[PDB]
Amino acid sequence: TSQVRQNYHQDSEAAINRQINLELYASYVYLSMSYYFDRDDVALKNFAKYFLHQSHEEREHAEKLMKLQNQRGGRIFLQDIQKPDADDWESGLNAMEAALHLEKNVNQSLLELHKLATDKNDPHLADFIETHYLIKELGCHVTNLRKMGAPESGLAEYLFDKHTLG
Amino acid sequence: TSQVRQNYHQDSEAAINRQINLELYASYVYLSMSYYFDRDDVALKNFAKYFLHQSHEEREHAEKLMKLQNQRGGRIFLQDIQKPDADDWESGLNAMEAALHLEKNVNQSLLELHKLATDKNDPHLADFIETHYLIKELGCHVTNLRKMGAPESGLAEYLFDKHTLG
Amino acid sequence: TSQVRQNYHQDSEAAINRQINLELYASYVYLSMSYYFDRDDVALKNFAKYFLHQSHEEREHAEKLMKLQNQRGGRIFLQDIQKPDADDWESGLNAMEAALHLEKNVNQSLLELHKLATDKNDPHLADFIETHYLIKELGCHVTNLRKMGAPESGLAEYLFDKHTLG
Amino acid sequence: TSQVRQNYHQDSEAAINRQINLELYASYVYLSMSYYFDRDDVALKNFAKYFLHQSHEEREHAEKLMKLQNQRGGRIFLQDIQKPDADDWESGLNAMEAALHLEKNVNQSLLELHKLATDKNDPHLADFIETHYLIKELGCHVTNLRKMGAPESGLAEYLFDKHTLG
Amino acid sequence: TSQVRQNYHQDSEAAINRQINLELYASYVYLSMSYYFDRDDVALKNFAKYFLHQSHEEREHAEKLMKLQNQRGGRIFLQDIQKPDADDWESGLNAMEAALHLEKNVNQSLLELHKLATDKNDPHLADFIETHYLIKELGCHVTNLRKMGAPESGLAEYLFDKHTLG
Amino acid sequence: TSQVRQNYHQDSEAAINRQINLELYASYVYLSMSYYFDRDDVALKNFAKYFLHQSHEEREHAEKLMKLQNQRGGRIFLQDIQKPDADDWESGLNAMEAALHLEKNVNQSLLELHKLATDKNDPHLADFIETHYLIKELGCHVTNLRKMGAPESGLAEYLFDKHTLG
């Protein structure tokens, strides 16, 4: 090629295709986590709308990644989206850790992306990718869930529902 | 099975899972066709902001099914989300006619859903596709693009962009 | 054929149109009666403003069906609007008795429509019609008037005009 | 017849009960013309707002007359309202021009009744005619389309649908 | 038959009189359930607001039918209103669970009233069922109390008394 | 048992409960009647919106007794709510006539409840009752109607609706 591209590598153009999927995955996942806490033998809305909100949130990420190609110049190639690993997320504490673990791999994907954003001397790519993500909050809640009665306390969670997910 | 269920001939619960996927696909394909029209060798923002905005709405077509599952008593099984057929489309009219067939499909599996539902005695289920699943539109856009010299008269597309999307 | 026709059967399409020549007949009837009461020599000034609104808000049914046909892919085939029965409407209940009578045939045709709307298994049709038009109220005007002494008492007349229809 | 009747010929009235039958027909035609442009294969919204609007405005045009009758101590004698004429109208251009002829006709009948007003010195009858009626505006559209590429250039009666009817 | 009665079976009516009396019983229980908690030896003001609030809504649900009955031209025939069933209800958990078993009952008598409608095609009757009824909320409640410790844990049905009924 | 019991006797307690089932019988009776006038073949809308109110504010007396009961340490032992005599309520005053005739037996009971409150020298019960429920208003209405010629003058009926019940 287009009249726009310049200093943009074919590798870099493939990676975003890769992330565009991975971030789309996470939306699928959190989506999957969101309605598990909406079903009655769990009944933990808030946990619901928390994950639905992280689901809408990574549902973007991509959507801004797709802007990043239709702007650096590349072409967006979309691949299927995968069903999640589980289907009964056991509990609040389990979920978060899973979310906890899902958000690392997502970020690992980017950490090597900037490592590709430097090896191909793309500063307009050596930006934008470093500041829209990151974990740790999803840590914490783990500690906040660990030290309580989770995932036993069912009581330790219905309280975590109000005073940290309200 | 669970505690809320009653008068929910499982057979339909299976199908509920299938719209979930279906409508998701819709939201995928519309996601596709949305960020092609942001491509710089197309640059048709409004066409984007339209498809970008049909994707979000057929997504919540599905979000507002996974709520119907839990509710009537069911259980939500997700599956992979397959890519669209392209992977990057042809023209506004081509995109338009596209959704047309697509929404005709996603509507086909619902009038195929009223039946089975309009039989297995689920007055509940009978009144949540009856309240808000409808396409007509598009079909009436298709017309507005053909008659104007689309999909070649690029001037037709660009004027359609500012007047029936602005 | 039409590009958005789907599950829309021809028996249906032709019976809609047969219903539009009813819903424009009453409008003409309610119009016919609205201005028998604007006559200087009975001059029930509300019964005039009442049946007027009725002819108005029963030319809106027939319109909403025209919005419907055109939305289901159909084609519209209007016919002559016959003229009501008789030009002198006598009095008050007798026209209220007329308007009752008239509403009931309009109801019975829609019941012949919906009964036809579940033979071809149309969800969209059968949900559109049933969410709108009924009747009763006039039932409680014929009574009142028959209960007060109408129509044969002129003081009964004017009072209901001035205390029910204001 | 009547006590209020005065200076009103037979003759004048009958000449009112046939201009009502006319103004009525015109709305029935404007209806037929407005919903023609509400189809899925025509797709002109502002055309469908226009004639529907003249539809009501002639509805009223016929009503004022009605009251004129009773005010004149007349007796309205309603006849059947005839269908069009046309179902396909069938382009933008070919519609107004059939309304122009439609409007040049109804006005032709105004003038005769008014000459009937001067042949009976019915001045309260004349001043009803020369207040809020007549054509032209259709004309200046008719020219506008032709000058634009109708009916050969759908892009014409499109851009006329938004630039003079929005 | 009655003048407004049309397309209404005996049979449908006498069913309404057996669904009225039922929604009626549905309120009485809630009262019995509200003021149970209004005791000095049970001490949950929020539960007490919550079944007294249901008690007010099922009564409305009962008034809604009366009105349809007559509106259908039916003749309401009231019966005794039977008593609970229970005076000690006799914890938070156990109250909910009998409210769930209760709501499933009255909904059962809806679904068979609805199917009653289909076996005659009574579409005005049918739209009164699928608009403003059903449970779930009681489902999604019972779980929470269970998971928290109820009835083995007054500290739970206390805590649930604020954090989901404040 | 009880810990807030003191100077509350068991003739009292068992007479309070007896009084609630009185005051719920009134509600049921007013409710049987409100939707009597809602019948198409009487339709005195205000008679319906009044007695409907009476059935409220006499379903609210009974509730004000349960709060009292539980306050004074007691227990609530509700019973079957017997049904009103006759489903057809004749006319306007006949319903009014009954309506007084029925207040005179809730008051008569209360007056019998009070004499029990001084013979056991209760102040808090003897003050709560004498500051709430009385009668006569209806007394004036039975007269007005009988003065006008009710019920037998349907015109005396409907006016009283409009000028006194509105």
Residue numbers in the entry:
A (entry chain D), B (entry chain C), C (entry chain G), D (entry chain H), E (entry chain X), F (entry chain W): 5 to 170
Can you list sentences taken from the study reporting this PDB entry?
As a standard structural component among protein nanocages, ferritin exists ubiquitously in both prokaryotes and eukaryotes. Structurally, the 8-mer protein is a heteropolymer that is composed of two different subunits (Hα and Hβ) that originate from the same polypeptide. We have described here a protein-engineering approach to convert the 8-mer protein assembly with C4 symmetry into the 16-mer, 24-mer, and 48-mer protein nanocages with higher symmetry by controlling the intra- or inter-subunit disulfide bond.
To answer this question, we prepared the third NF-8 mutant termed Δ3C-∇C where cysteine residues (Cys90, Cys102, and Cys130) were replaced by alanine (Ala) while Asp144 was mutated to Cys. After E. coli cells expressing this mutant were lysed, we found that four overexpressed products occurred as shown in native PAGE, suggesting that one polypeptide can simultaneously produce four different protein species. Three of them exhibited the nearly same electrophoretic behavior as NF-8 (band 1), 16-mer∇C (band 2), and 24-merΔ3C (band 3), respectively, suggesting that they could have similar protein assemblies. However, we only found conditions which are suitable for the growth of crystals with the 24-merΔ3C-∇C and the above largest species, but not for 8-merΔ3C-∇C and 16-merΔ3C-∇C crystals. We first solved the crystal structure of 24-merΔ3C-∇C. As expected, this protein consists of 24 Hγ-type subunits, the crystal structure of which is nearly the same as that of 24-merΔ3C, confirming the above observation by native PAGE and analytical ultracentrifugation. It is worth noting that, similar to the mutant Δ3C, one polypeptide of the mutant Δ3C-∇C likewise forms Hα, Hβ, and Hγ subunits, and these three subunits can simultaneously stay in one solution and assemble into 24-mer and 48-mer protein nanocages, these findings being in accordance with the above observation with the mutant Δ3C.
